[PDB]
Design an enzyme around this catalytic site. Sequence first.
Site, PDB file in Angstrom:
ATOM      1  N   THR A  47     -14.304   7.546  49.268  1.00 22.06           N
ATOM      2  CA  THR A  47     -13.168   7.759  48.360  1.00 22.06           C
ATOM      3  C   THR A  47     -11.809   7.258  48.831  1.00 22.06           C
ATOM      4  OG1 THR A  47     -14.272   9.607  47.243  1.00 22.06           O
ATOM      5  CG2 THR A  47     -11.820   9.549  47.131  1.00 22.06           C
ATOM      6  N   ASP A 166     -17.566  12.640  40.600  1.00 21.48           N
ATOM      7  CA  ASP A 166     -18.037  12.645  41.991  1.00 21.48           C
ATOM      8  C   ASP A 166     -18.545  14.017  42.447  1.00 21.48           C
ATOM      9  OD1 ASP A 166     -18.222  11.145  44.621  1.00 21.48           O
ATOM     10  OD2 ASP A 166     -16.883  12.740  45.230  1.00 21.48           O
TER      11      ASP A 166
END
EC number: 3.6.1.29
Length: 379
Positions: A47, A166
């Site tokens: 990320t 996510d």
Amino acid sequence: LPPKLLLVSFDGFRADYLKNYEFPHLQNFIKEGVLVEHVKNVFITKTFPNHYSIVTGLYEESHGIVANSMYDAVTKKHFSDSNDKDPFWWNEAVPIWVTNQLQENRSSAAAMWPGTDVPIHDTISSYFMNYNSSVSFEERLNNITMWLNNSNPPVTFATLYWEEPDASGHKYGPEDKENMSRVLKKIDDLIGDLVQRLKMLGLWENLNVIITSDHGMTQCSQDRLINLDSCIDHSYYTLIDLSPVAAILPKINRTEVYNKLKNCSPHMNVYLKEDIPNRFYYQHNDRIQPIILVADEGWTIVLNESSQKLGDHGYDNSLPSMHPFLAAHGPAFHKGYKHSTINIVDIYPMMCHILGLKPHPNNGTFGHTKCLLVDQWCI
Ligand SMILES: *[C@@H]1O[C@H](CO)[C@@H](O[C@@H]2O[C@H](CO)[C@@H](O)[C@H](O)[C@H]2NC(C)=O)[C@H](O)[C@H]1NC(C)=O
Ligand SMILES: *[C@@H]1O[C@H](CO)[C@@H](O)[C@H](O)[C@H]1NC(C)=O
Ligand SMILES: *[C@@H]1O[C@H](CO)[C@@H](O)[C@H](O)[C@H]1NC(C)=O
Ligand SMILES: [Zn+2]
Ligand SMILES: [Zn+2]
């Protein structure tokens, strides 16, 4: 009136989700704009590294955010997603919100995007939110769009970040269609909330909006585990990051640690730092540890007590499962155009162009994005 750009990331939005679930709101956004079906992102596919690549146009070895957890041996500093506020970690590059903010009579704004609550080269966005995952999407949306619409000097660049899909992709795994379809329907609804809001404020016709993500997700399994504790004793090394790219700092002779790790599982590649494949652009930075372990797709590196996680990302950036998508709408973008692929580092030169900013040296290729843009030749 200067051009405006809103950059939105829904974390962990695997490109092929578009092909396997229904996104009526996103598809409406797309039909009056452009879609890049899959974006080739950067290794490692985590990320913080990929969000920084989007806003810098740089590979991870160049911008310095090489994982969600890092250790700098020289300064002894540690980085984690929560412990991420030391500018040291961000200062190897200059992200687009800083370049935009440094222009006279223009401001940047941010709602939760990684790094936007940190002064980078002493520059912070005019409006930003201290990272707080509890803040609703509605609050993030309403504040970001109000800032773009109001504000003086005008807000010309804005970021908007959301933690799904996510979070739930990790929980269920992307192969759990029943549960993921509910997760993704909510994301589609949020996209509808975004469009409805833009229209209500009269921003929809004149604001450039990019909806994208940082990486995808792949299924993990108890049948696909590599236990480091079965292969090498704890006393031999310090673990800086675990799975699926383990960052290994030897405590004893590196050669000894390497010899054990290379004989642990055929389902990972074990690299001395100097042997990391060139195609990854993941070598030339002191924050990359002396040995890295790269698990094959769908395999998880574990310790004895590591928790189950049905979905994960971080793998080889050539894998389709790791790629996000990109879509865009606004005055700078064609209507109803669809394109196969671009590289994630290409987004930066594209955004600087739309905003009339001088890009810093980068690894992107503006040419890859020309077919998306109204003012450009499409070969
Ligand atoms: C990606 O782009 C960066 C930015 O230009 C390149 O990094 C520069 O590389 C030269 C020599 O390697 C150095 O003199 C600069 O200081 C570097 N800048 C930064 C910010 O690191 C990098 O080489 C490019 N990567 C690839 C694979 O082409
Ligand atoms: C995080 O956001 C929520 C919702 O706005 C708020 O109630 C909470 O106080 C915030 N936490 C911190 C530490 O600011
Ligand atoms: C959203 O906007 C309101 C009104 O300007 C502001 O008071 C609030 O703090 C903002 N929320 C944030 C910064 O999380
Ligand atoms: Zn992510
Ligand atoms: Zn994740």
